[PDB]
Swiss-Prot record:
Residues involved in 2-oxoglutarate binding: Y149, R181, I182, S183, R187
Uppermost EC category: oxidoreductase
Keywords, alphabetical: Dioxygenase, Iron, Metal-binding, Mitochondrion, Necrosis, Oxidoreductase, Transit peptide
Name of this chain's protein: Alpha-ketoglutarate-dependent dioxygenase alkB homolog 7, mitochondrial
Annotated source species: Homo sapiens
Length: 190
């Protein structure tokens, strides 16, 4: 339902490395995050785009000070996705416009440890993972609003990830129309 792959072996190999938990958040939790983050994101302009930037059509913030309700959600993510690992001192909040997208990349190994965990809000999208040496090994993850994904180990180090732009936004054969998306990303310390 939420993962498709280039073949059975990549699917088995990454089954606990690339994880989607649809409906990890309740509607109330989605609302908590939106009410806290929408106003903060509105204070910033969508950034200038660059050809050699991974992220296109976006604004963002780092946030370490959170309401108690949002902190309860972040602690649920930490329990679900991270061992005992330490998290970075801030959480990355990313606002992609409907025309925005993310190009294939591997998160910096200088600043991010073994695990990335992301909450998706507002609208559905498709995350594609592609092996960095072998373009024939890939996964597609369907990220609906309220979902948590986890990329760890090989899914974090050996595969790029990207968020498909509207015209390319397909989960298998199915078109996933893109809208404005907010994501809330927790990362481990290296
Ligand atoms: O929006 C997401 O879920 C991922 C963002 C991302 O890949 C990044 O900021 O490195
Ligand atoms: Mn920025
Ligand atoms: Mn990334």
């Amino acid at each position: 339902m939420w993962v498709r792959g280039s073949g059975p072996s990549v699917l088995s190999r990454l089954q606990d490395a690339a994880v989607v938990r649809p409906g990890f958040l309740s509607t109330a939790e989605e609302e908590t995050l939106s009410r806290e983050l929408e106003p903060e994101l509105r204070r910033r302009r969508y950034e200038y785009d660059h050809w050699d930037a991974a992220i296109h059509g976006f604004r963002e913030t780092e946030k370490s000070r959170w309401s108690e309700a949002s902190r309860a959600i972040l602690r649920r993510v930490q329990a679900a996705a991270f061992g005992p690992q330490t998290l970075l001192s801030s959480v990355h909040v990313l606002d992609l416009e409907a025309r925005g997208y993310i190009k294939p990349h591997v998160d910096s190994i200088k600043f991010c440890g073994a695990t990335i965990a992301g909450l998706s809000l507002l609208s559905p999208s498709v995350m594609r993972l592609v092996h960095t040496q072998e373009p024939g090994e890939w996964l597609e993850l369907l990220l609906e609003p309220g979902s948590l994904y986890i990329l760890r180990g090989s899914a974090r180090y050996d595969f790029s990830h990207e968020i498909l732009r509207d015209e390319e936004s397909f989960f298998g054969e199915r078109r996933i129309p893109r809208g404005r998306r907010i994501s809330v990303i927790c990362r481990s310390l290296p």
